Symmetry: D2
Subunit: 221 residues, 4 copies
Amino acid sequence: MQLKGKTAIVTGSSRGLGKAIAWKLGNMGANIVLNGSPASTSLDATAEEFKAAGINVVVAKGDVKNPEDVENMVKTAMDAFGRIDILVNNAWDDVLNTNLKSAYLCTKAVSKIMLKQKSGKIINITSQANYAASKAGLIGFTKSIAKEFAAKGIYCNAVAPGIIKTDMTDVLPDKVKEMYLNNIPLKRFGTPEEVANVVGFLASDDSNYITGQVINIDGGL
Amino acid sequence: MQLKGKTAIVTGSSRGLGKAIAWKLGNMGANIVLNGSPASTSLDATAEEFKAAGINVVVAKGDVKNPEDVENMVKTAMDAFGRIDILVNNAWDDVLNTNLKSAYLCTKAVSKIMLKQKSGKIINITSQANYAASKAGLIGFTKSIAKEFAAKGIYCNAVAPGIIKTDMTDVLPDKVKEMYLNNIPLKRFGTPEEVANVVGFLASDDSNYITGQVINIDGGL
Amino acid sequence: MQLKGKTAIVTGSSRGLGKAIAWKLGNMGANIVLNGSPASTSLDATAEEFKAAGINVVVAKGDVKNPEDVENMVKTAMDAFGRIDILVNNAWDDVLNTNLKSAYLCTKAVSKIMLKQKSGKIINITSQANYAASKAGLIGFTKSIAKEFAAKGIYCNAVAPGIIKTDMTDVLPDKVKEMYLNNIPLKRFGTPEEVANVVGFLASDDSNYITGQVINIDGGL
Amino acid sequence: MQLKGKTAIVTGSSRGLGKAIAWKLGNMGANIVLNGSPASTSLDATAEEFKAAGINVVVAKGDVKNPEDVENMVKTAMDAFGRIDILVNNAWDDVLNTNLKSAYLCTKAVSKIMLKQKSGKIINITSQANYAASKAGLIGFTKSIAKEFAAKGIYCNAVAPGIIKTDMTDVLPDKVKEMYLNNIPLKRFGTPEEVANVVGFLASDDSNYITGQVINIDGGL
């Protein structure tokens, strides 16, 4: 389909949002590099599920907050598929390290390969003051990277989800759930699939000529 | 395909960007209501082209800056297809009347029908101080409408194109063209098809849960 | 004081916010041109109050939504003081005409004089979809004018007040008042004097090098 | 004057922008806590200059990227003046640590005292991808802190300078200088005094009711 013969790396893709994003890209025809902890019980199961659905998938085990694991991830992608068309960066000190620093390291490593291709899409997914600074940081980073690599044909955009349906939100007390729901103009939580569909758009040719942008998927919040 | 059995009204769709937008929506399976001046030489030709390509199309002739023509447009849509799922608003006194006032009147008229459906997507396309105020006005209008109709399931978003390939840009002197190109990070003009693809995204279920947003398609400008 | 020997025109300054703005500028040492309807009972009283406080004041009677009255206003300023250093623009068809069109006409007229001076500060004060489009329009207009006249030393900025204390807010039912107050992080309404103080800043040399900006004075709303 | 009997802490205030900011606040009548490295040749000279000008000044020596020095700074302020009304936060791992982490630690420490006062103003001064993320991070942090402490009367705003006159810019080659100047609508660099004047505004009662805002002082850039 839309991403036939392309390779997408999705960080933090063993479960939840990352898995849904990788699932959508896989079903658009992309070769998938899943990423997660070596200690993940779900990582291997997820890969087998993808393969059974007809998605070509390799697994890079490690923590993308560490340079050595980032290098491994890139090497397993290249060994498997020989190219990287799409990087999805999905993931006080611990907060800025987890979200923002992983995005920085992965972008730095993958950009080397995208520059040789003269092609590539980098899509950053955003995750109180610690989170706010990290989120805004990732957006500024996005816009900076977009500006820097625009001349070379490489895209960088961000997706900023509002409140998305999780295992936690499902078990929310009805009163605390109604308080959040009442603060969202659309009066419902978003879904992992909706976020995945927006990343699908940003990965496809349908989003050509869009760079340095943030798409808020938050129900008008 | 994605918009099978849905009806899209695209204002100013006899030629250029509007025609490209209507073409994309048509090819996604939507019933199309084209709009343009009764004096258009291209309007009828465009409709025949769409029909030959297998797109179900009706034509509403008039100027959408006038209430009576807006009512006609809505009536021809309803007479033809019985519903309106998508409105694309594409188009000192003359500046604010052409862009912004047409968007206001069409939204007001179509919103009545979308409220009964409890479903609908309104997509506003932006067009020196006169243009700047109009553009910013249309964006504020977009965000206001989104907030107002969110509770009822109706979406409102905007697409803001930068410099797009036209008949005018093609005949631009090479020096004036190079001056514009050098001010765009991606170092090329956008295309009508690219804008059409973004409207395609905003019209489809892939953009569910996104409201009150502006997508800049400007090559990082 | 700070504005000694300078002339400020404040539109809609017979009462309320405009009067408070003109009062602050007057007390900073500026020559003041008050503006209001010929039918104003308060305009003359306000001018006499200013004079008794030691402020040099002239009155331009008319509606600044009309070109002829705009010309009169400019002429009474020039006849009185021979220069214009500061213009404060304070004020579906009726909405866009009142706020935005007055700002456009006054700026156009005053800019001719500021260009000869190679000096000047234009400060636009913002006033549901009609209001939202008008407000956003005035902001886009502000940014456009700033860009256009930057090379010539002329500044353009905007002040965007949130909920400000009025005669209407004072008589608000306690329950409707508590609903608004609870939606403002600072948990109080703003005052006309606070807005006036921000305009005072934008009129003074303390705001040199700031152009094309909007200052939100809304208690974090 | 405006800040009589108030205490302002200005981080990184031994020289340059920080010194100019502290100078302005001092001359508005504030008690000043200067901050800089124990190895600073200029810190002591600067304090003596302030004292000779009639400014009440104490010096906190240390690096505000370290918790122990932040505690010292707060303790020297409290020992000297018994209160803190104004904190000015002025200053890949090294980039995020220098700008953003110092702002975080100082705000955290000073906020404890401001909460007891139920009064306080925190003013963050912004400093390629590393800088962009840090700058955007500090802005998001600002907005978060403002939201968090609004209920308690504590303000948080940011100042974002564009290109400001330094010792480096003065010795810039004329061609590289003309390239920067041509990219600024006002066609000149800003000055440390201009930045200081904006902080002066944000420290004074003239900026009451403004919170969670960023003032760009960049000549329209």
